[PDB]
Design a protein around this ligand. Sequence first.
Ligand SMILES: CC1(C)CCC(C)(C)c2cc(NC(=O)c3ccc(C(=O)O)cc3)ccc21
Length: 136
Amino acid sequence: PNFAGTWKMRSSENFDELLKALGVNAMLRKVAVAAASKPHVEIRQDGDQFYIKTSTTVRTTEINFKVGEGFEEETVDGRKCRSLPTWENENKIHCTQTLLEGDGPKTYWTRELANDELILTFGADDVVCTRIYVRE
Ligand SMILES: CC1(C)CCC(C)(C)c2cc(NC(=O)c3ccc(C(=O)O)cc3)ccc21
């Protein structure tokens, strides 16, 4: 499956509840939720090699990884973590995160390519956030 290209968000669900579950300050969530509404996503892929740039006005993250090989990135709430990308299935990547410093909610994300739509999922313990993207 090809995740490469530029994507824009079609819908988000529970992004605020996610930030709640991760203990983010109501005023920060206000800013985050706002910025997260109009995110721009760039994905360059080469087999298991992935480049994903996510941009908003107040924060842009650039992650690079090889499915099957751990890498370092940040959690949704900015905490630096250790990540473990894996092919859950042919078109879905599952990624487990373990915080480098401190302790917190068990988090992970999963990116799935389904019907030319990119389904992004953020988990913070029991809370699940679903963000659907379409090819811009
Ligand atoms: C105000 C500030 C600095 C506070 C710290 C946290 C709470 C860490 C934070 C998080 C975001 N996150 C996003 O903007 C975002 C956009 C798109 C996606 C996605 O769909 O991939 C995910 C997250 C934006 C701003 C901030």
